[PDB]
């Protein structure tokens, strides 16, 4: 099981590719779509590349020997109207030659290659090299130096629609330069978003009939007096069960080791600057999963309360976002009886730059200023918006109750 082109191992699918075995084809995609010849004769419906032409183009390169190796089977030809200098792909990644991700898809020799004029990578946390060929520039703000490999898997993890400079969010110049310098913007959706659990979290809704005396939970009717009405007031709380007319109500109560790197140092980073006076810590000796307390913010009905959150971060933090939930019940709108939180920045607006003090801020800020016009709970959004003293009256007398 070799690719047909450069005769390797499918090896990490990051560096050569998603190694593809169909129509009894065996290949790496950045191999088929780096080959210099192959001129997507197919609809998109091997990505655009009929195994005829991939036949020719294996043909074509057992013609042609690899600069590295000695060895045949190379297809890869530095685009260079003189040079002649062709190689195999991963040859060409090891030795240091540059292969681009648009237009042509054109690659280039060490000899020829674009460069750049040209501390820490930020997003790694660690010292960067003094090979300037793994060492990547903004043109953008920070101009920062990343390594190449960083800035490969937050092109891999966040998709295009979410490459975007980590500071000034460039989308424009950014990524043209990135995609001029060799870096793969691979057209999809962001990783978080493509794993299977996705986020169903924000999805669910309360399906619970909590009366004593049921007419019957599990199932409840689309309509009738068997269907479902939820409490006006929290939303967290069948409708002939009710025992009101459908003709409102309200319930009772309302009557992978650069990942554990990065996280020691944003775990120190918090306890040198705690954002809203929050403890945060490990649980037991998971540093994948937090536990923190915040204390709530002045000027909000929920000033005085404690609120406890759980944080599970991923194995490719900080590529993709951490999971937070809170453990205290909250009376808000973008957060739910399970303690989900609605918040951009957990799924969208992602920047592998942003910390978890910056997570833990911008949830101080969304209990200050929350969103009503995208609510994870409608029947609170609407009160919100319409009568804000209830509103807050019921925050606060929640704040009492629970919380604090
Ligand atoms: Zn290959
Ligand atoms: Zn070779
Ligand atoms: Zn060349
Ligand atoms: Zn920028
Ligand atoms: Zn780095
Ligand atoms: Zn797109
Ligand atoms: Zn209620
Ligand atoms: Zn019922």
Aim: charged residues 25%; aromatic residues 10%; positive net charge.
């Amino acid at each position: 099981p070799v690719c047909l082109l450069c005769l390797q191992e499918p090896g990490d699918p990051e560096k050569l590719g998603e190694f593809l075995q169909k129509d009894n084809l065996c290949v790496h995609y950045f191999c088929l779509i780096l080959s210099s010849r192959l001129p997507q004769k197919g609809q998109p419906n091997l990505h655009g590349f009929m195994p005829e032409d991939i036949k020719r183009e294996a043909v074509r390169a057992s013609k042609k020997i690899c600069f590295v190796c000695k060895k045949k089977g190379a297809a890869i030809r530095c685009q260079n109207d003189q040079c002649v200098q062709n190689f195999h792909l991963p040859c060409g990644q090891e030795r240091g030659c540059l292969s681009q991700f648009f237009g042509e898809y054109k690659s280039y020799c060490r000899k020829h290659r674009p460069t750049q004029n040209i501390e820490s990578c930020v997003l790694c946390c660690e010292n960067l090299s003094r090979t300037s060929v793994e060492n990547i520039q903004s043109p953008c703000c920070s101009q920062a130096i990343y390594h190449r490999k960083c800035i490969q898997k937050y092109a891999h993890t966040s998709a295009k629609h979410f490459f975007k400079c980590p500071q000034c969010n460039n989308r424009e110049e950014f990524p043209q330069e990135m995609l001029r310098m060799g870096i793969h913007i691979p057209d999809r959706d962001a990783a978080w978003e493509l794993e299977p659990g996705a986020f169903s979290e924000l999805y669910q809704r309360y399906r619970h009939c909590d009366a004593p005396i049921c007419l019957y939970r599990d199932s409840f009717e689309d309509e009738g007096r068997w269907r479902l009405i939820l409490c006006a007031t929290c939303g967290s709380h069948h409708r002939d069960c009710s025992s009101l007319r459908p003709n409102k109500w309200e319930c009772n109560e309302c009557l992978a080791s650069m990942a554990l790197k990065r996280i020691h140092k944003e775990l120190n980073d918090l306890a040198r600057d705690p954002p809203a006076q929050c403890r945060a810590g490990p649980v037991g000796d998971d540093m994948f999963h937090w536990q923190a307390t915040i204390m709530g913010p002045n000027d909000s009905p929920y000033q005085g309360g404690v609120f406890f959150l759980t944080i599970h971060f991923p194995t490719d933090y900080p590529f993709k976002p951490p999971k937070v939930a809170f453990t205290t019940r909250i009376y808000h709108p973008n957060i739910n009886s399970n303690g989900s939180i609605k918040l951009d920045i957990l799924r969208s607006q992602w920047s592998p730059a942003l910390t978890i003090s910056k997570v833990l801020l911008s949830i101080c800020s969304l209990l200050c200023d929350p969103n009503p016009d995208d609510p994870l709970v409608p029947e609170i959004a609407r009160i919100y918006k319409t009568d804000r003293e209830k509103y807050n009256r019921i925050a606060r007398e929640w704040t009492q109750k629970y919380a604090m």
